[PDB]
């Protein structure tokens, strides 16, 4: 089978805190002696354009309350970096995991720990879409929820939740304070670009299908990558690139990528009542790495 | 969006259980390590006499590792398709917990583990044929299924076998295999899966709450009539329409109008989608819909 999994959340859970300032509560991430959180926690009035330089100049540190579980942390300073605050606290988080910070590229997979009131409530794997939004399930109080990847025994922190667009899509920032997609932490209408289906992931999905004995859709005709990309630009798919990355899957199956590109074109019109590993339509949720990991443990 | 509950409380309980050449996962709670009994079987490609295997078990063949610490085995007893291995060490990270047995259609979380280390977490439903749609390869046995409720962990599933169809079967922690399946390497076939009607209705209510209403008509289908159609078309009966009376009041749409949509939509969406799906979806319970959109349990 093929299931969209999250990487385990235990290491990240110990870092989530509640950040309160004046009349707002949201979540922060406590690493070392710093708590990271969205800067709009200090905005007194969010019904019109926020002058964050002004809000920062009037910010008073005694209005913060930072809570780890049931313990209060002492706040000693706070600086603004893009759309984030780095709040310096008086104790080191002794549960800080081995970590780094990374900025997601388009299509890259990660995990969201959905937090409310400083406490984790759900965890899920997700992909950064080409329009720099994600389909999260975030409601009131979710800001500051962290996105992460586990790699080589290290936690990479990649996302801090910030806003919900009118479409229902979700936008966050890196921990550098750069909002994905250049969206603003401002209460005005913002519209995202059209989403594209991630071709590299659909291809990985079709390989997984072959490996599971689901091959009714597979045919012998190939479609060259340059010809597929001409078709993809006009039909809402990303272009194919990095074909060599599929070598492990092509070897195990004996099916070249260009035969799967041909399949994408035909199956984009619908499955006609058939299913591929349980889906009634093409699926771009799984990367090459996830397919290889779940089928072969590599 | 399909999500799982956080895994941090369960992760501290997973251990590596090795007996001779076999390695799988165990669950360390108090001074007991729970794991599948086939860890002690000498040959798992032919029929297994577990009473024989238990009578020749030698405890020095066990190695149990939590993180990098070795646990000391002092006894082991067999209960159904599980072993309860008593160790000297009490797990100081044992959460408040209970053991519960899943009902047909009930949702829960799997922590997929290998070599005694968690690798992934995902939500699943116990299906009407007592299998789950998991994703496991060699070494996954003993991976635990859990729910977080009322400040405790409910442990509900221990992974055991993969059927020839790819469906997965586990046991409760009292050693009862879900569905009555055997921990034997023989051909066993599951019964036909049914679509969980209550979950489809929740999905359609979620569609209405997101203003996705192209499919919604005005005709009502009485519960008794729907159920007659469902028994012949691979759907479960509608039951407990009262839990949906909160959403019926909130949307102004009665369950009978959704039952009629299921019957119509089961023939296909005709190129349209519902919340991004091209066919009826039974993966989301009323609990999940309400938790994710309204924040309440
Ligand atoms: C959706 C809302 C209309 C409220 C607004 N959106 C837009 O103003 C936009 F459309 F312009 F983006 C919006 O997100 N905010 C308004 C205000 C902050 C942010 C906000 O409250 N964030 C929440 C953090 N706890 C997470 C949200 C809550 C609902 N679901 C979420 O994910 C700031 C931009 C300073
Ligand atoms: C799939 C396999 C053909 C190997 C077999 N299936 C059948 O015998 C059947 F089909 F009948 F069910 C089977 O699951 N097992 C053979 C042997 C144990 C069990 C087994 O290996 N459990 C794994 C635990 N680490 C679970 C994972 C799940 C994914 N793949 C696995 O191996 C026992 C039944 C004693």
UniProtKB/Swiss-Prot annotation, chain A:
Listed result of changing residue 40 to G/S/T/Y: Complete loss of 3CL-PRO activity
Annotated effect of mutating residue 161 to S: Complete loss of 3CL-PRO activity
Domain Peptidase C30 span(s) in chain numbering: 1-298
Impact noted for substituting residue 143 to P/S/V: Complete loss of 3CL-PRO activity
Catalytic site: 40, 143
Listed result of changing residue 63 to G: No loss of 3CL-PRO activity
Role description: Responsible for the majority of cleavages as it cleaves the C-terminus of replicase polyprotein at 11 sites. Recognizes substrates containing the core sequence [ILMVF]-Q-|-[SGACN]. Inhibited by the substrate-analog Cbz-Val-Asn-Ser-Thr-Leu-Gln-CMK. Also contains an ADP-ribose-1''-phosphate (ADRP)-binding function.
Protein name, as recorded: 3C-like proteinase
Organism: Human coronavirus 229E (HCoV-229E)
Record gene name: rep
Positions spanned in the full protein: 2967 to 3264 of 6758
Curated annotation (Swiss-Prot), chain B:
Effect of residue 61 to G: No loss of 3CL-PRO activity
Domain Peptidase C30: 1-297
Effect the entry attributes to changing residue 168 to T: 93% loss of 3CL-PRO activity
Effect on the protein of changing residue 159 to S: Complete loss of 3CL-PRO activity
Mutagenesis / variant outcome for changing residue 168 to S: 77% loss of 3CL-PRO activity
Active site: 38 (for 3cl-pro activity), 141 (for 3cl-pro activity)
Effect on the protein of changing residue 61 to A/D/E/Q: Increase of 3CL-PRO activity
Function: Responsible for the majority of cleavages as it cleaves the C-terminus of replicase polyprotein at 11 sites. Recognizes substrates containing the core sequence [ILMVF]-Q-|-[SGACN]. Inhibited by the substrate-analog Cbz-Val-Asn-Ser-Thr-Leu-Gln-CMK. Also contains an ADP-ribose-1''-phosphate (ADRP)-binding function.
Protein name, as recorded: 3C-like proteinase
Source organism: Human coronavirus 229E
Range covered out of full length: 2969 to 3265 of 6758
């Amino acid at each position: 089978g093929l299931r969209k999994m999250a990487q385990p959340s235990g290491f990240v859970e110990k870092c989530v805190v509640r950040v309160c300032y004046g009349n707002t509560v949201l979540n922060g991430l406590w690493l070392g002696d710093i708590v990271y959180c969205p800067r709009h926690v200090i905005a007194s009035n969010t019904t019109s354009a926020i002058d964050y330089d002004h809000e920062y100049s009037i910010m008073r540190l005694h209005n913060f309350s930072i809570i780890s579980g049931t313990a209060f942390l002492g706040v000693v300073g706070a600086t603004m970096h893009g759309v984030t605050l780095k709040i310096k606290v008086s104790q080191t988080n002794m549960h800080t995991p081995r970590h780094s910070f990374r900025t997601l590229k388009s299509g890259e997979g990660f995990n969201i720990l959905a937090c409310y009131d400083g406490c984790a409530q759900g965890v899920f794997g997700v992909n950064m879409r080409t329009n720099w939004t994600i389909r999260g399930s975030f409601i009131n109080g979710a800001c500051g929820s962290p996105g992460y990847n586990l790699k080589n025994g290290e936690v990479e922190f990649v996302y801090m939740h910030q806003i919900e667009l009118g479409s229902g899509s979700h936008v966050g920032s890196s921990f550098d304070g750069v909002m994905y997609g250049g969206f603003e932490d401002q209460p005005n209408l913002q519209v995202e670009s059209a989403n594209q289906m991630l071709t590299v992931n659909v291809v990985a999905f079709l390989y997984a299908a072959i490996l599971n004995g689901c091959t009714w859709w597979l045919k012998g005709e190939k479609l060259f990558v340059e010809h597929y990309n001409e078709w993809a630009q006009a039909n809402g798919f990303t272009a194919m690139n990095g074909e060599d990355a599929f070598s492990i899957l092509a070897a195990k199956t004996g099916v070249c990528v260009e035969r799967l590109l041909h399949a994408i074109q035909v199956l984009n019109n619908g499955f006609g009542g058939k299913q591929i590993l349980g889906y009634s339509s093409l699926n771009d949720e799984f990367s090459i790495n996830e397919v290889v990991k779940q089928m072969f443990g590599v």
